[PDB]
Amino acid sequence: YRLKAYYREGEKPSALRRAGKLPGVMYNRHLNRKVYVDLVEFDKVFRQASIHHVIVLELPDGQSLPTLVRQVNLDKRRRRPEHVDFFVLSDEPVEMYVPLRFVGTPAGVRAGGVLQEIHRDILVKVSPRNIPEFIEVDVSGLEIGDSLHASDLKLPPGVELAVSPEETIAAVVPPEDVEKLAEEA
Amino acid sequence: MLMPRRMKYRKQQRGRLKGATKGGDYVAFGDYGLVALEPAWITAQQIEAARVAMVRHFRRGGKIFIRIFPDKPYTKKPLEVRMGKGKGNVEGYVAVVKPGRVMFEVAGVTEEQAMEALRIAGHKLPIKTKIVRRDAYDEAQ
Amino acid sequence: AHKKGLGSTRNGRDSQAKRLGVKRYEGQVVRAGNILVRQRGTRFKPGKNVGMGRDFTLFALVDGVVEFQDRGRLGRYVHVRPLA
Amino acid sequence: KFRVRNRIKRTGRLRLSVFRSLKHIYAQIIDDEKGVTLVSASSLALKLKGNKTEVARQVGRALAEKALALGIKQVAFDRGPYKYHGRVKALAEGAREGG
Amino acid sequence: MPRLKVKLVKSPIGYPKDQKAALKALGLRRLQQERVLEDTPAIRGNVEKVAHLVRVEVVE
RNA sequence: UAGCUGGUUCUCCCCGAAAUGACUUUAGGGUCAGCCUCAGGCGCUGACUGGGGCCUGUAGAGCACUGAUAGGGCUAGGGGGCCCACCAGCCUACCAAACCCUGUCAAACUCCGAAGGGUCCCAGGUGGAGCCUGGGAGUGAGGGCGCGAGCGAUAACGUCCGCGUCCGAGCGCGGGAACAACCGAGACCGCCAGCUAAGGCCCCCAAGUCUGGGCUAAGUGGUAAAGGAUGUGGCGCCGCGAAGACAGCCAGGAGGUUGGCUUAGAAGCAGCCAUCCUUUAAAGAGUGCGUAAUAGCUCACUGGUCGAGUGGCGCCGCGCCGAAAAUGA
RNA sequence: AGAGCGCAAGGGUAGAAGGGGGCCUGACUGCGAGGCCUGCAAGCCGAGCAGGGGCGAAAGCCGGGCCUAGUGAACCGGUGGU
RNA sequence: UCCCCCGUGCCCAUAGCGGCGUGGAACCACCCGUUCCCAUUCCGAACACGGAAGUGAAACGCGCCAGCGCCGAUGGUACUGGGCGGGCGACCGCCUGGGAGAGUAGGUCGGUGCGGGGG
Structure with missing residues (x-):
């Protein structure tokens, strides 16, 4: 979905942020320049899609170049957004x-x-x-001390996998009742 | 209450603490998370007291994960014994905590529940904190 | 004041530390006999017209210029170009 | 695997790289500096006799003369798995003082 | 290659060794001094060095 | 005798130290080396910096080794068993070799590893620079201030080092009210001459009660915290409303039911699990209060009046509480 | 390369220092440029040259030891000897 | 001056690992023999030596693929020369020049120099 876009240049990082606009970057096999956009609207859009769904950034160059996000590098201290990476889409194999x-x-x-x-x-x-969009997978009847992983999940045809897939997807574990205070003994 | 199990050197140097936190600044685990704002130590005593505090508040709860680990000696000397002579004794095991660091996560509860759990528990912590949800950081191994 | 017990020690010791490292860097002239590297191991294996001895030391064999070298699957090296 | 830089133990100065197959000798004189080689002779690759040993003798001997024929005194002797059986060229005739 | 002249503004009195040695390199001995010295990036390096205790100008 | 204490007389002109490195029956003492000095020898070489080339293992950061580690997987297997042996077979919210995924810890861990720093050549560089012999020294209790590590309790005007700077020897000058080392600042003399540094410009006191915009209402300013709050003023978001919200104001505020269990009795209502559906504009298996359980007050919720803005979630600027001590404020 | 690398640690190590056998005794003498280190005095590095040898056909290395601890100025005197 | 194999050198893993295919008419390798030189701490496995009808299985040489392993921009944060602050403090911010680590896209099954034997 749609967000604006802005071609970046050789302007200092800090300022762009403490003016009004978060800075960014885009790259696809060969196409690499520097970019940036608004904060508040960007944050709004992100909070929905981000690296889940697709972004479409109509840029002050005439077009409407659609990307995905990718990587959200922050300041960690008082952690919060500060420069992301964008991925210029196509039709080629992508994890x-x-x-x-x-x-x-x-x-x-x-x-x-x-x-x-x-x-x-x-x-x-x-x-x-x-x-x-989202594999609305089962988890019909997981038991306590029971697990599920691998290709167990339904995969929308074509959308392959990219782990083992013996990567355990999830599991159910015990609570933490006040009987864990008796453990303190 | 956590520590290693007899390892390398016993006594080590406390040092000053900067504030890059090196890492550990998102949820990934639970669902609601307590993260800190003051560069200090987390005390094993406190550690346990806060973990409890949560557990205590919500009888028959979910799963409370502890990211940080208290593995640093308290070089403490006796009392009224004059200076010099030896270092101290390893005592009170704690850890380095630099602000913008996840320390505990609550999963599978009410909104209210994790709210007041992290609230009270961290309220018992050697400093003060911020309590965050789980979103803006996604994508980080 | 109460001065009762006090846990002593058995630690404090070090070394009349000799000064070890690359004595002569590159671009430097040697009259042969000038040692360019005092090392403990072989962090610097012999170069061209550079010799080694009992204490792992790259020293000069001629009157020329120290030239530095690296060889990933063979180590690091220090040599002496002729200057004829 | 007689690597060992038997090369290095002869990498004093100026080599002479030789090696054998099933049936053919490959006697060559290699100079280093840049890597430039120099002088050749081969038991069954010079179109010569078909008896490994003696040919090699002569072949080295052939090469031997060739050495002095183009300005050679003393060099090294690059041989891997030898068990030192001379190959009674041993380039001992070989000008060089092979043996 | 235009000339570079500087004016000594802030006292040397209380600054690291390199600073002092730099001032003592520039024919600069006490405050308020128009020092007209031809360009040479060595000198310039010694300017960006002393750059604060002084004031600059590339006077032609 | 006294490696101790004490005293040690005239004037100007020049440079100008050190409170360290080792060594000792030494620690409050002497040789030595560094630092001051003066004569004679040397002549761009020295401090500093530009360029090139090299060495390096810290600040970070990483987990690939060293160990520490939290959570799950997978399992060698260990408690195990179901239950046959020339030996097998299948089997857990127990714990657990390793591996894997999930995060991470480090002065004595390191795949990576900078800003720096040291140093060898090209060149600028004329300066109480640097170099070489030579005589006389004095020094060898230091202190403060800044970042950098140890000690200590991330206490001490504490201590012990590192680079740096001042006091020391600049208790000479202006600030900082006062004030060795904090800011400004290197004081030959004279001047009833101007600029300016810090710091200031109502007055003590010399100069703006200068111009313009924004804040605060406590003597805050005129010296403390976590932690608490319908303090104040701008910023951002999120549902509600003329089809009528917010508050108050009328009225509805129901039934299976006294929910299943507990429980002496638990009837929305001390707790356990709950996780109905039905008449309805709307009345929930309940918001607190009330009972011996009951009753009951009330709310929640929708419509009647009313007729315009309302309920709240974060951020930020300044305050409020937090906040008791010894002669006069 | 995580084992062994005599014994603490660290660097180093198979393109061997480790591990096997043969041979031997340079665990030489007379020196020693030019260096590391450095208050002094000490300690630490080594080609080379002569002798006369050990190993290898040689090329070649050999003036102990993978490297850094295993040590004691001088005065006194014993010692074989010129 | 060229297309192929071999004796051998240089960069340092974008060369290594692994599935696929492969070439011997010369080279190369297995392979034929263990009596002459030689030797297994035992075996002719290894080095050694005299030698054919076969082979191209392996060893090796060459091509394809990225799957392991390797390198890895760009941006921006870290950290910091040197310059100024702010807080009792634990610590924090502005200036300039320098400029990582981890990751993201992409890239990688080599590069090249010599001397002979072949067409």
């Missing part, structure tokens, strides 16, 4: 994370023990034509 949707409340759950998941996004290679 990226897909936010997953654990749907349905299992048996390990409701018995007490709660899901201690591993991921909320999986690395997967796809053609940029496939948009796997």
